[PDB]
Amino acid sequence: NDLCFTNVYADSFVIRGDEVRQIAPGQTGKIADYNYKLPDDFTGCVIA
Amino acid sequence: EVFNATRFASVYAWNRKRISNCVADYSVLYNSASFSTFKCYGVSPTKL
Ligand SMILES: *[C@@H]1O[C@H](CO)[C@@H](O)[C@H](O)[C@H]1NC(C)=O
């Protein structure tokens, strides 16, 4: 709440079933490899 | 012949099959979606 940023982007999508945990930096799997890949130095948070 | 085996042994008497003197194609197990988890320690699954 105190810090400030130049821009923020909100990427919204739905995932069902297992692998929901795979949305995290440096993770492997069908979802992380073919569907949505996060950068190694990603700074932010994932809410589900 | 190991992964599509008819019946697996109990954990008290686990089986140990030795695989040798052959060409081992590891691409089928990696791309096949039939596995629920595939986590490798020591070596990366994509350079195998
Ligand atoms: C062995 O298992 C694979 C796994 O999909 C299957 O495609 C193949 O038909 C099976 N073969 C036999 C002889 O059980």
From Swiss-Prot, chain A:
Location of the region described as Integrin-binding motif in the Swiss-Prot/TrEMBL record: 16-18
Function field: Attaches the virion to the cell membrane by interacting with host receptor, initiating the infection. The major receptor is host ACE2. When S2/S2' has been cleaved, binding to the receptor triggers direct fusion at the cell membrane. When S2/S2' has not been cleaved, binding to the receptor results in internalization of the virus by endocytosis using host TFRC and GRM2 and leading to fusion of the virion membrane with the host endosomal membrane. Alternatively, may use NRP1/NRP2 and integrin as entry receptors.
Subunit structure, interactors included: Binds to host ACE2. RBD also interacts with the N-linked glycan on 'Asn-90' of ACE2. Cleavage of S generates a polybasic C-terminal sequence on S1 that binds to host Neuropilin-1 (NRP1) and Neuropilin-2 (NRP2) receptors. Interacts with host integrin alpha-5/beta-1 (ITGA5:ITGB1) and with ACE2 in complex with integrin alpha-5/beta-1 (ITGA5:ITGB1). May interact via cytoplasmic c-terminus with M protein. May interact (via N-terminus) with host bilirubin and biliverdin, thereby preventing antibody binding to the SARS-CoV-2 spike NTD via an allosteric mechanism.
This protein's name: Spike protein S1
Full-protein interval shown: 388 to 435 of 1273
